[model samples]
Target: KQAPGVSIITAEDIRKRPPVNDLSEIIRTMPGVNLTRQIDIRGMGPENTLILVDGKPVSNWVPPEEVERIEVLRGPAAARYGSGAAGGVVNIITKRPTDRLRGSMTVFTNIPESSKDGATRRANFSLSGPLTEALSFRAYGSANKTDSDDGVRNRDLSGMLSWQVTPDQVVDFEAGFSRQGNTNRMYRENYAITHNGTWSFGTSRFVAQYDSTRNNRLSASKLENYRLSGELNLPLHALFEQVLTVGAEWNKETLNDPSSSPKSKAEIRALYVEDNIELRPGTMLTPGLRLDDHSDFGLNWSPSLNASQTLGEYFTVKAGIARAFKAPNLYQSNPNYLLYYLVGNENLDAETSVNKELGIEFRRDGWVAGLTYFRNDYKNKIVAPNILQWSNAKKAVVEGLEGNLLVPLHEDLSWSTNLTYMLQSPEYTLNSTLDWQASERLSTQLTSTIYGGTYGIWGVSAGYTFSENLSVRGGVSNLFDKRLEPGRAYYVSMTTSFL
Candidate 1:
């Protein structure tokens, strides 16, 4: 699952793309985008998908302009990521301070063809520089608004400081505040500290983070989440050469709602270990096991075995089998934390799944393509069958094929596409992008998204670089004008940088 199923959205890709107001606005074009408005991978529903900022799970809006990279793992990577990752993981990595001073200011706007739709206005500012020889800082802020009867407005502010305690150790402290308004309002804040150290044997990292959210719409509720995590990577020389990783993480969640008599709380403690062993000259295997101890559900184990073999100069074979589980949420685990007529079932067991995938990849001269076959069996799925209460009363199976291809037509031009076609239904999703740099200052891109039965979505954009510190870009988002929201909107942006 690592070869063809893995996709990364780099900062450079985000920087050159247009009309990207939010994460979903852009990543929705990825192959794994779900049907309806939910997010999913290959085999699970919306609740099964886990969204992480760096490695910590989050439910807040992060401006795409502040992201460094986004990695979408399209499989049950629960052996390494733990619960809630049975479907997949979307890890958002934010930009960090650099050795050299750098910053940027960007302003953008979008106007729809018809006044019936909403118009958007957005602006963001960022700055990063070295505060001292051994310390650096990065900070960014964003403001956005959509003008319409039903629209959302949000503001984001975040900053981070990095301290080089020594060449062998580094530390980071970060904090953020965000707010959204739609007549109904919500506020969120987060703080985190992380330490990374390089030891003689291996590397280790420790993290402590806290997040809190408050909303005004429904009974004035507040939610808090905290995590304490640490991991060590060590190389051992035994009968076989292998790298071993041992990790532990603890999570605590608390929810305060007017419907509940007391504050609802849930906690989970987890420990895992993995070994990467080179079996032969061109073959490698990784085995992992994890134990999760929940305050209410007791303890559960997740295990996985993965391997890869080099078949020839142009091909590599990969396969993996894993067991994953997702514990109930705070609302579902606490019988008192009721939402209207919906009640929680304390007897519910953790939803579990078994996933298996086989994939083969080929690579040469920046030309790469691969296909993977995957299947998953799930049980004990928690659901509100009658729309009144939560219970583990569902079972399901899913099978699909995922494919990817990349062709570098020239040194600065390329075409890339990804595909996901399901075996159970006559449904397939495809996304393709073609980018060509005509000159050092001019570039163009074409993007398309296709559904199996109907006409697809298409868009085109162009960018021009004025200098190292300035650029301008504009584009039409819905080139096909297919009667979607704001059919065929035009957008433009300008960005200026400083040293």
Candidate 2:
């Protein structure tokens, strides 16, 4: 789905809510961001999102402490991003090694008011250092366990090495592993090699990656994915003042399961082209296309057009209409890749959507505001109606309104809010917050959320930076204690770093 909005979750924003491990914890509370909840864009499911870490697809989660920032792109996806992007895109940018050797230790815990509710405790550490003048390395480790079955208990470890081949080029190698899901015994392992180059013309990127997940409890016994992707961006002064992006992606997917055929596999080859052209002084247009050649389903195409108009220094408008596509997963379209409880259908058609959006934004005097109206025409949605076999839903429609605002109440305090209302759906989501930098070393925030489901919820938190290397934070969640089991939580965290 293509929309006309982008949002960023800064490192500081993450620090405000901690003792929580998942990405869902931080982004769900973002006041003015476009994300609905977790990875669910436009109130859709997470399966429709394309998530990346440092420009590479990953099967495992990256620790929140290792993230520098999060970039969220919502709108027309298929033209520039191949598949699994019908809803939106989430790119988690991680922290890299610094010029000097640096290390950090963090401890976080949450205690519930009621003894029946489980508590959360987590410890994480990170270290980075220069191996040589042109080389550096970083390592991270984490341990977390909750006291209840509804919670998480996972162990994580990862390492990365970077080589500064030249002033304009850098290469990175990474390996990671995680054991998650206490009941299912899920294990994930991944490795990647990546290179980024900046030239006078523009930029280029190349990545080769492999990831695998093994699990039991009605889950796949083994699922593996391999990817090779490359991209180049060039500026051409030719016909229009345009910047062109050319890219290619190749993927090989394989599944091994007791309920399915042995060694079921599929491959996808895709090429995409996008150009940003400045039509006039205050007008810009982007047109893109992507071609995907699938091993079993033959070929498919996606095309998109987006226009941006800047009326003045403070106001702008954006509109887009795009065609997006998503191929069936191994279990949905492969006759041999069947689930234990259901059979797979080989004649299934790929899911597709035609998306449209219009938005207007204002920026002046430290005030940021935006409003958007969007609709998606969905076709061939995969549905397991009767369970005898998987099939497609012929039609569906989603129409919604989204808006955000940030206002400077004073020099050290600001008020921000985000709202989402669906015309076709009855529910709504509203988030509002007041952030105050009380002093040079002290900051606090008060937040309220109308989840569109519940009627009462609030939270308060404070952070104090005692020194360059030491910081402490404490918070109270569910201030009114109005949720399940009727218990509020008190959380505390400490982080220390040295160089």
Candidate 3:
């Protein structure tokens, strides 16, 4: 079933674009998505957006080559993925092991001509095939190095094994480890393991999943996340279909700083239920409720509702309302002295918000367009009042309008763009990309972005397909050479398949 406000970026889109060291570059021009210092959804910050890899929460370093597609859920995802998804959810779906034995490799390098020690190099390898008639395995590895002053470096490796127990049952296991560090004495190492199972019986289905992560940071500070979840889907009468889900999460963090204690932990239990009902032939309603019990903040309740109405084949209208929350992280609630005068607040309350949005979409031929208006009322926002401790802001409001369009100029030429405006501020953003195919083997793309209605950047890229199994792309960014901006940079990438 298609959700009211869901967007997908397919593998073909990724392969056609120039590679970058960070994933944010791949989605910067996407509708309703924003990237500043961190990825944001609508006008919300990164803390409110959830990032998932293959249905599990993981770090943000997945190589683009390993991604099969990206799902952008720009609606009330908190009802399904928990508190961090208050703004939205970015789900990175990786390619699965297939029955055929095939593999691919990618190498990427980028540097800015205006800066010294700003060069970065990356390499990725992936392979997938069947280990047996009923079992399959896939593995991926990536390594990165930066020649900057901070001395940044990262290495990640992961493996997945899937077993088809029966025609209606399947089991899967995934495990990964990654280490990243920079020059500011900041460092982190991550370890994750995930297991899940699915079964279907007639029109009813069931799912069970488990995920655990361990993060070790600088100064002996360690954080652990453990989660267990299950879901059941049952078909009711034509009026509505019922889907029920429940989960539990445990977080344990320790800070071994000079003036702080060693350990802090919290547990959360959640239950959610949603009903998908058809009000009419072209209209649908989804109502959901989530109940959460936090060890530190007691019990909380969240509710959401969404509706979509299709007017023939050219237009659709959607509206939704949801309440979401974000519990205080370990550092914010530690209640221990950290430096000369800084300290944590143990009496912090969870940050909460109520959000509402209305949107409409139009599509005809090869042209598409959408517009949405949204508002958020938030409370208990955490902030550092002074150097001594943290406190909560009483209340705040944010409102914005977002829109996008895609137009096909010709059989081999297309144009796409998105814009965002803040109602409370004079802020506005516009981004556009135009692609043209010169021949069967050569293609060109031009992109430009304008932010704050003044500062802008332009880029041009070209791609060449040498054969069915090999391709190369090169690009130059910041064509105007704006020194105040991120500066001009050039990049190239190569991809080849081996079987």
Candidate 4:
């Protein structure tokens, strides 16, 4: 509930990973991003990282094993979550409804013989209360199904609701609907054709080989959120020394691609209002605004300016700057008549970003240090041009830099690390086609955590992932598996959270 500088990944890091069905496979160990299944948000694909449970929005059908606490913000953090998060931001935060009634139940199974899809089982339960104190309520839900062997199979359902009207005012809502479709899944891209010989008066010389077809993906997404934000605490000197804050939020995201036969939908909306003031005690000032309408890149407006400082008990500092945006979906521009090429360009627009940060926070005994310095400036950028044909492609101009760390030796044990350094200058065009020739990148991450609880709550975590094109084989180095200096990637998990 408090980031204030940032260094988080709790809930014992989602109870030790190893049991996976996407969710970026446990947030890819959070830091300096390079997720093979999407969650580093650029060019967005894993359904745009909209996984929320407390602050609404949650569509992968909640399957992160009923997640609880996972807030990883990378760049373009519009003052604290807004926009698609540019290319980094994972906020899972789940669990609520307490005041005496509680319940828990969990059962999981995973068989990994190098995993060709063999065994999988999951069952979860929850019950919460506090229904009368000024009118209160709570409810939760979970459902999941799985299958593997390369040809995926999945089904999910998520739920939530919370209320507390009167007594300061409170409201919460969450929704999730998911479907991971698959069939005939193997190979995926690279075309090939061949035919040779004969060149007299009927010229002929053919030899084309580069084929990779047969990969089907069916996704039905739904994320719903409604926040009647609450706040009403005015007391500075009683009357004129005021202290007030207000709110209003409505966010919705929908993505449905039925392999496009008459199926393709994208919806994004944000309606917000905020205000804060308290010129004294510790000092406070918050000015926020957001208004966007997106069905397919229509309108957008974002603004932010936050400040927090307390130079005493430990040390604190927070800074912000914003004007972020990312709205352009429909596969980027549509065009894939079952693989005839061109998969998106409905006219392309909606990618404007400018995010900045400056942070420092520390806690004495036990040791804890947080440092942040970020920058992201992207404009009208949308790319995926392997030889543009479906109506032109490729666009770029990306920037990056990120760092994170956490340390606590004994009394349980904890060690964390994060690093992301970048220099992406892409906009190619040499034999002239649509700009090309600009490459230089780096991304990294490191983690380690050992837990307490003699014989009850357990824990163990490990990670090392470096991507300098991950070793270079298939473009972006097969999405970071090339392995090089300044970067590397790998992960191990083990955790437990019970109270």
Candidate 5:
């Protein structure tokens, strides 16, 4: 109902987290998003954020029961996703293809009260109805294994497919592969394809993707990526009544580490447009633009603007501003030896940004809340100024405040929380959750996390549902393991369904 600094995480919050095996660990509590080693938004990083699925753009990983919701578009989406969003945009909305013959199956495990190498195991399966009636199909598969505690070992596999052929057309395919090791091993593979079209005057999509990776500990490597994209959504009435979105993208990347660097390639091209105005009714406006070409930073332009209003049945307000960019990868421009005193910077230039945000929302009948404030300004930021090379730094500034809350402690109980803060590299986060049903087949949940306030942790989970097809779940995290840090943990899961 509103955009600007959007945030949404559903599918029952990924079935109440704690049973992770990826999907970015349930996206770490959402609000403004962040995840240390990778994935970060409000505070930038991770190549300035941009990950999508269902709206294209993906580089592997997407499975939390195949998501059906997850949108986090904080500050800038460069008008509608272009140039890594300049620190925002995470969209993963899947789950479609139904007709009637359902299916589901899951099994999960994890235990580490004393680390048996931090054990873990997983399995998943899914299928979708109607293989006829103009064609319908959906499928999913997964398998995983893990062990850590300082010995590292991991394995993974994934699969997906969907086809709906008529009723508006659709097609999708997915694949993922992974490997981690103890001695020397690391591998990754990903592939994707999508096509969709709808009528009544709006919708069209196309995507193609590929990625590969390899590593053998030390100076060994391989990496590759290729992508293509297309999109169109038109339904305009010219000066008012609108909905127009157009896009185009192309990308390529390659590297094959050989004793050092070089043997690289990079390319990019993009075009975008977006507009969805409706300055009346409840008031809304969105504008966007993007143009990029870079094979080494050549041409670039990005723009964005957003607005929303609704102040009558509760409250709402939103605002936005943006301009984004990022380019310069290939080991930062072509380091031809990786070490021996790193070097490589053929006049690098492209790491720009300008973002702004403001948000507010509140609701009733149960409860809901939100608050946002953001700012970012970056230019030629990429840095490394020491150990030999890679430079471009002059300005960098980030500011933030993000918050959220949801409550409904009754009819089945519920609660949620999130908070984040950043004031130029000074960061903080907190997360909370509580859900209890305790009846009609039991249910329970409790979670807490805080980092930056000297660390904190708490977790508990439970579930049971021996009806509607079967279910079972369990958990035990950190619990009384005070300074928890992978200290105590346990898990169990079971699921079944068929129709």
Candidate 6:
């Protein structure tokens, strides 16, 4: 079943919103979620949030322009998405083939007011129809190119096709690729340039810099992702559910930093299988497993088990337990000659986690609410070293409380909100971990929406959104008062969409 408190944005929203330089802008109205502009790296960074494409892992190759709609499962209730998803999960569901031929094109200029400007251009098309009386055909493709003021350009393209052989069996496949190129001046510190784009860093400051001799630093990344999915039904009602889905995915990424004394490459492969079953009326269970094989490290296994039981007509309870792991990054295992911080440790291990969550759902008469609790045991997580390097394999723990509520004030207006409180602490063997205690992770988002349309026109979704988009976004987000910060890591952004 879909998430109980989840919010879904339709394709019309994608066109109206376009693709901002920051992917997070795609879901600005989505509660408990935020976006940031990035040029040379994936969005994962040091955060625990996980992004997905159709319930599968995406190697950061998906371009925001190609997103059909976004599904956001907020609050602790989001455990239904998967393990290690306590921060929440943003699933970008791409448009698939159907019986109609449809397409769209969008372009937007981001950061136009700033002296340094950024822009995005995108286009996509789809064609779908019946190939035979018993078989249907669908195909689609999209491309996006983004350029930022700092001389970095990122581009991506993806395509997918599907065949419905019968009412009981369907086959689908997808392929995606993305590349990012960065220039030397892109990652400069704040003092390096003034608002007018002139030199600001003084000679004395440059002389005192850690890597003053370094002329330019270059980093590039390329990713390729592919997946094959099929669903079949067991008419005999065997060990599996009436419908069983099996999928295979292969993703690879390569990072190159010419600035380093020695170039680096880290490759990881994730192969997974899952089974979903409906045991009885209003009861369902899913079991899954994945294997990660790394070039630098050996193999690791991740297992997951989840179930949901219905107590009455509009009430259900869900719980899940799973093990997940994140592969180390270039900075995580390599040495940095400039900053002298990253000390190469080829033997460093990938960080791993054991996660568990449980939640209750209630729905009736256009009202929806959910509450959940989740915990995570993190190990081998990388922390920044005093020097410019990254490699302090230590342990950490995270726990949280979350709740969501949705109410319909009228046939055309609705109110939805999310509330969460999280606590995190690091345990380092080399030092007193208390000094590095995580900050208070309290977050909340509220949205009021009005939607309507005529028969011949696509729908329009106009929503008043308020929340923390960034540290800076929250500091000065208030319209009436200029508050430096909201006393928390939050920023407010408002957006609307028309189909």
lDDT of 6: 0.46
Residue lDDT tens for model 6, 1-499: 2243355777644433334444564454443333333210011222445566665544323444446677775433333333235445667786665564444333333333333444444434444555555444444444445555444555445444454444533444444344445544322110010011111221110000010111243343222222222222223257644444333323333444554545455554555555667888788887777666676777877777777899898888888777766666555566553344355566677667776777788888988777766676768766565544456457777665445666766654455554444556711000000011122332222222211121111111222223222111111112232222111111222221221
lDDT per residue, candidate 5, 383-403, as tens digits? 776458888888878898888
TM-score of 1: 0.95
- 253 in model 5: Cα distance from truth in Å? 9.9
lDDT by residue (tens digit), candidate 4, 1-499: 1243233556534544433455564554443445544665332334334444344333233545456677755443433345555554566666667766765544554443334434455555555666667433334443344554453455544444445543433444433333444543322222222222232322222222221223343232222222222222333444324433333333333334355454454555555444455566666666666777676667677776666777888777777666766565555556542233445656767666666666666767756555555555656655555325223224444444344545555444445454444446511111100111123322121222211121111222222222311111111101232222112222232212222
| lDDT score for residue 46 of model 4 | 40
Best by TM-score: 1
Give lDDT per model, in order.
0.82, 0.80, 0.73, 0.45, 0.76, 0.46
Return whichever of 2 and 4 wins on TM-score. 2
Cα misplacement distance, residue 368 of candidate 6 (Å): 1.1
How would you encode candidate 2's per-residue C-alpha lDDT over 229-306 as one tens digit per residue?
Answer: 999999999987999999999999998887664777899999989998998889989999999899978888889898
TM-scores of the candidates are 0.95, 0.94, 0.91, 0.29, 0.32, 0.61
Backbone clash pairs for candidate 5 read 101-129
Query: Which lDDT value does model 3 have at 424?
Result: 41
Per-candidate clashes come to 0, 5, 0, 30, 1, 11
Task: Point out the higher-scoring one by TM-score: 5 or 6.
Answer: 6
- For model 6, the run of ten residues with the poorest summed lDDT: 428-437
RMSD of 5: 23.9
Cα displacement (Å) at residue 271, model 4: 20
Stretches of candidate 6 off by over 4 Å are: 1-8, 12-19, 26-48, 54-66, 72-89, 109-236, 239-273, 334-341, 386-389, 426-499
How many angstroms is residue 227 displaced in model 1 relative to the true structure, after the best TM-score fit? 1.1
Q: Which residue ranges in model 5 land beyond 4 Å of their true spot?
A: 1-5, 8-15, 24-71, 74-82, 86-152, 155-184, 187-254, 257-262, 265-297, 308-313, 319-362, 369-499
TM-score of 4: 0.29
Ranking by TM-score: 1, 2, 3, 6, 5, 4
Error of 5 at 211 (Å): 18
lDDT of 3: 0.73
lDDT tens readout by residue for model 3, 110-150: 78767753877888989999999899999998888887632
Candidate 1 lDDT by residue in tens digits, 1-499: 1265567888778877844457766665555556455567784777777888877778525666678888888664444787888877888888789999989888888887777778888899889999998999999889999887337788989899999999999899999999999659889999999999999999999999999999997268899999999999999888788999999999999888886666888888999999999887789899999999998889988898888899889999988889998899888877776675788888889999898888899998889889888888889888886337788856788888888888999999999888887754257888888999999999999988777836677888889999978999888877988873447788899988986
